[PDB]
Design a protein that fits this description.
The structure is cut from a larger assembly and holds 4 copies of chain A (62 residues). Chain A has 62 residues and is low in regular secondary structure. Chain A is built from 1 helix and no strands. In chain A, 13% of the residues lie in helices and 0% in strands. Chain A is globular and about 45 Å long. At the A-B interface, loops of A face loops of B. The structure holds a DNA duplex (17 and 16 nucleotides).
Chain lengths: 62, 62, 62, 62
Amino acid sequence: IGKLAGEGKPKLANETLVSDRDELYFDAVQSFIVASQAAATKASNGPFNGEFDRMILRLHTR
Amino acid sequence: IGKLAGEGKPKLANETLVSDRDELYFDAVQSFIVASQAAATKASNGPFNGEFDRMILRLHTR
Amino acid sequence: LEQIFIESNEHNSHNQISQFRHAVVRNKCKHNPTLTNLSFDTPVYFSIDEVVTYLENMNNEV
Amino acid sequence: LEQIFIESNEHNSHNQISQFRHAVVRNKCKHNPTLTNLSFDTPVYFSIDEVVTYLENMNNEV
DNA sequence: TATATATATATATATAT
DNA sequence: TATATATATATATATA
């Protein structure tokens, strides 16, 4: 998620904002921006990032 | 693994991504780049790195 | 060999055990070259002092 | 006291704990100057507001 | 909570204009 | 004089 002024929402790979999660995350996989601390392109990781790594594989397998 | 743009996949020693694991992992051991946090060279560690150390030796023994 | 020297403590041993074995293997290969296909448990000679020297050179690696 | 005042990472606060102890120990001697060889665990008067403001001062030191 | 590796303004210094 | 170039410190995220 980006932290710039007026962009407290998730950013897409095309520098487009995600207003409502329930309408997009279901359609298909998405591409996001790179995480960096530069003031022009600042973005911090999210709450549940990196945690759900093994579960995806286990479930796809099952 | 590499986390740069459009590179949501692994990365070897020779800067070459991978699509389907099953195609190369079996043939011969491979070496990958070192973990790093640079904005240019962003490499993170894998999900299952480290865990499987013992059973390898146990099997080589048997 | 993993009981006489390395006590069970300090579970954070992923690196330690791996590099230990990787050191013993090479020290064995050096002083007994005539043979082939050596291993961890293969009974050939090795200088534990040299193992110490190597581990130290690693401890201060720059 | 270590239970009632300090509440963090049950034992992962080696800095704050020690500085707290130093504050109390050096404050006790101010308000009961006649006594000798005072220690932490010793039962004499010691004000807590003074200690709070003391640390609040250490915070913004330059 | 901690350490650590990243980072970024802010000098002072060197040199060439 | 102006312009460019190099160390120090200080604040923020990420991992355990």
